[PDB]
Write an enzyme that holds these catalytic residues in place. Structure first.
Site, mmCIF file in Angstrom:
data_model
loop_
_atom_site.group_PDB
_atom_site.id
_atom_site.type_symbol
_atom_site.label_atom_id
_atom_site.label_comp_id
_atom_site.label_asym_id
_atom_site.label_seq_id
_atom_site.Cartn_x
_atom_site.Cartn_y
_atom_site.Cartn_z
ATOM 1 N N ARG A 1 0.762 -1.186 -0.175
ATOM 2 C CA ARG A 1 -0.047 0.062 -0.352
ATOM 3 C C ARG A 1 0.869 1.456 0.111
ATOM 4 O O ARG A 1 0.281 2.621 -0.239
ATOM 5 C CB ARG A 1 -0.723 0.226 0.890
ATOM 6 C CG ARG A 1 -1.840 -1.133 1.073
ATOM 7 C CD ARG A 1 -3.006 -0.986 2.275
ATOM 8 N NE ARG A 1 -3.115 -2.419 2.981
ATOM 9 C CZ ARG A 1 -4.517 -2.316 2.923
ATOM 10 N NH1 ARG A 1 -5.514 -1.789 2.999
ATOM 11 N NH2 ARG A 1 -5.172 -3.386 3.477
ATOM 12 N N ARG B 1 -21.238 -4.609 5.344
ATOM 13 C CA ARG B 1 -20.647 -5.587 5.493
ATOM 14 C C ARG B 1 -20.860 -6.981 6.348
ATOM 15 O O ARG B 1 -21.072 -6.485 7.385
ATOM 16 C CB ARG B 1 -18.887 -4.846 4.654
ATOM 17 C CG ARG B 1 -17.942 -6.754 4.818
ATOM 18 C CD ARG B 1 -16.576 -6.136 4.194
ATOM 19 N NE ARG B 1 -15.920 -5.679 5.433
ATOM 20 C CZ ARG B 1 -14.545 -5.307 4.625
ATOM 21 N NH1 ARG B 1 -14.013 -5.723 3.641
ATOM 22 N NH2 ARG B 1 -13.905 -4.584 5.300
HETATM 23 N N1 LIG Z 1 0.101 -3.782 3.553
HETATM 24 C C1 LIG Z 1 -0.400 -3.008 5.106
HETATM 25 N N2 LIG Z 1 0.485 -1.793 5.336
HETATM 26 C C2 LIG Z 1 -0.203 -1.285 6.377
HETATM 27 N N3 LIG Z 1 -1.279 -1.484 7.102
HETATM 28 C C3 LIG Z 1 -1.924 -2.643 6.609
HETATM 29 C C4 LIG Z 1 -1.787 -3.469 5.034
HETATM 30 N N4 LIG Z 1 -3.079 -4.122 5.050
HETATM 31 C C5 LIG Z 1 -2.951 -4.262 6.035
HETATM 32 N N5 LIG Z 1 -3.347 -3.080 6.488
HETATM 33 C C6 LIG Z 1 -4.015 -2.816 8.039
HETATM 34 O O1 LIG Z 1 -5.020 -4.048 8.409
HETATM 35 C C7 LIG Z 1 -5.834 -2.744 8.515
HETATM 36 C C8 LIG Z 1 -7.097 -3.942 7.334
HETATM 37 O O2 LIG Z 1 -7.406 -4.210 5.905
HETATM 38 P P1 LIG Z 1 -8.061 -5.481 5.535
HETATM 39 O O3 LIG Z 1 -9.339 -5.582 6.612
HETATM 40 O O4 LIG Z 1 -6.991 -6.409 4.655
HETATM 41 O O5 LIG Z 1 -8.727 -4.616 4.553
HETATM 42 P P2 LIG Z 1 -9.182 -2.873 3.780
HETATM 43 O O6 LIG Z 1 -8.210 -1.917 3.413
HETATM 44 O O7 LIG Z 1 -9.986 -2.910 5.644
HETATM 45 O O8 LIG Z 1 -10.331 -3.715 3.323
HETATM 46 P P3 LIG Z 1 -10.435 -5.183 1.987
HETATM 47 O O9 LIG Z 1 -9.676 -5.496 2.118
HETATM 48 O O10 LIG Z 1 -10.947 -5.609 4.200
HETATM 49 O O11 LIG Z 1 -11.658 -4.708 1.794
HETATM 50 P P4 LIG Z 1 -12.033 -5.791 0.099
HETATM 51 O O12 LIG Z 1 -12.029 -4.712 -1.377
HETATM 52 O O13 LIG Z 1 -11.510 -6.845 0.346
HETATM 53 O O14 LIG Z 1 -13.371 -5.771 0.167
HETATM 54 P P5 LIG Z 1 -14.303 -7.417 0.434
HETATM 55 O O15 LIG Z 1 -13.840 -7.882 -1.139
HETATM 56 O O16 LIG Z 1 -14.899 -7.800 1.527
HETATM 57 O O17 LIG Z 1 -15.725 -6.591 -0.331
HETATM 58 C C9 LIG Z 1 -16.616 -4.964 0.481
HETATM 59 C C10 LIG Z 1 -17.629 -5.766 0.608
HETATM 60 O O18 LIG Z 1 -18.553 -5.465 -1.153
HETATM 61 C C11 LIG Z 1 -19.231 -6.682 -1.187
HETATM 62 N N6 LIG Z 1 -18.874 -6.853 -2.232
HETATM 63 C C12 LIG Z 1 -17.942 -7.327 -2.951
HETATM 64 N N7 LIG Z 1 -17.306 -6.764 -4.624
HETATM 65 C C13 LIG Z 1 -18.433 -6.521 -4.517
HETATM 66 C C14 LIG Z 1 -19.343 -6.276 -5.960
HETATM 67 N N8 LIG Z 1 -18.994 -6.112 -7.008
HETATM 68 N N9 LIG Z 1 -20.734 -5.287 -5.808
HETATM 69 C C15 LIG Z 1 -21.118 -4.565 -4.589
HETATM 70 N N10 LIG Z 1 -21.226 -5.436 -3.988
HETATM 71 C C16 LIG Z 1 -19.528 -6.320 -3.900
HETATM 72 C C17 LIG Z 1 -18.401 -7.761 -0.357
HETATM 73 O O19 LIG Z 1 -20.031 -8.392 0.090
HETATM 74 C C18 LIG Z 1 -17.959 -6.761 1.118
HETATM 75 O O20 LIG Z 1 -19.617 -6.510 2.131
HETATM 76 C C19 LIG Z 1 -5.937 -1.449 7.674
HETATM 77 O O21 LIG Z 1 -6.919 -0.861 7.330
HETATM 78 C C20 LIG Z 1 -4.761 -1.598 8.363
HETATM 79 O O22 LIG Z 1 -4.899 -0.941 9.154
#
Ligand SMILES: Nc1ncnc2c1ncn2[C@@H]1O[C@H](COP(=O)(O)OP(=O)(O)OP(=O)(O)OP(=O)(O)OP(=O)(O)OC[C@H]2O[C@@H](n3cnc4c(N)ncnc43)[C@H](O)[C@@H]2O)[C@@H](O)[C@H]1O
Ligand SMILES: [Zn+2]
Length: 213
Positions: free
Chosen positions: A88, A127
């Protein structure tokens, strides 16, 4: 198959990962899952990561690059891997190039899933996450077959504590602060593909999968 799935919080990375992993059987490596695992072990790393995570801040780069070094050196990534939400930052990106260059390897595709801010916010409001496997649903947009139960293992669903409105706003801002120069990093090295994530889960997947083969 050395892939990075990139996108802002709520872009559908986890959701798309399940599909790519299930299809190509490469390990899913999400830093956010790793920090939550350390929090569950209750290691010191976990306790320290959690202060940041609860605010919606990035966990410091050195800590983060650390766990990624360790993890990607495991033999299960030798034939490929799916990094999800790493890197990131530019220092994460670099340290990734370097640790892979030490293994005679490189990242080959950065798939950047693009969604506008308003949609991202709606996605992280309804979510829900599975207690058993960590998979996400959405009460409106992508519900489980049976209310409250994961489709894969019957696991109970719950709301991640950081998916509250204040923390989400912080999370989108912090991560975006890093994004453009990182796109520019990868765009300049000729591996970056932007993907319209703002449509059906199946359709986003086709766009990804085109690239993967
Ligand atoms: N590299 C790094 N460096 C520093 N710190 C770090 C780091 N990595 C992590 N951290 C730390 O850790 C924390 C948490 O990290 P982490 O939990 O990885 O991720 P985030 O940044 O919080 O976002 P996500 O990865 O959880 O979201 P995503 O795109 O996977 O969403 P999903 O597919 O659920 O989809 C979301 C929702 O949308 C829905 N959905 C999915 N696709 C669609 C679609 N096409 N249309 C409609 N709805 C949809 C799903 O059902 C769901 O409800 C960070 O805040 C930071 O503190
Ligand atoms: Zn589950």
């Amino acid at each position: 198959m050395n892939i990075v799935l990139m996108g802002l919080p709520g872009a559908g990375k986890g959701t798309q990962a399940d599909r790519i992993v299930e299809k190509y059987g490469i390990p899913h490596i999400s830093t956010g899952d790793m920090f939550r695992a350390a929090i569950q072990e209750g290691t010191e790393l976990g306790v320290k990561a959690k202060s940041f995570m609860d605010q919606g801040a990035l966990v410091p780069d050195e800590v983060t690059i650390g766990i990624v070094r360790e993890r990607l050196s495991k033999s299960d990534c030798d034939n490929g891997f799916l990094l999800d939400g790493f890197p990131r930052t530019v220092p994460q990106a670099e340290a990734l190039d370097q640790l892979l260059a030490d293994m005679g390897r490189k990242i080959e595709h950065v798939l950047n899933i693009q969604v506008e801010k308003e949609e991202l916010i709606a996605r992280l409001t309804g979510r829900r996450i599975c207690k058993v496997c960590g998979t996400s649903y959405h009460l409106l947009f992508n519900p489980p077959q049976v209310e409250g139960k994961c489709d894969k293992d019957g696991g109970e669903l719950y709301q991640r504590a950081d998916d509250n409105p204040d923390t989400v706003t912080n999370r989108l801002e912090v991560n975006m602060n890093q994004t453009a120069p990182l796109l520019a990093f990868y765009d300049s090295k000729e591996v970056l593909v932007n993907i319209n994530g703002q449509k059906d889960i199946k359709d986003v997947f086709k766009d990804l999968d085109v690239i993967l083969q």
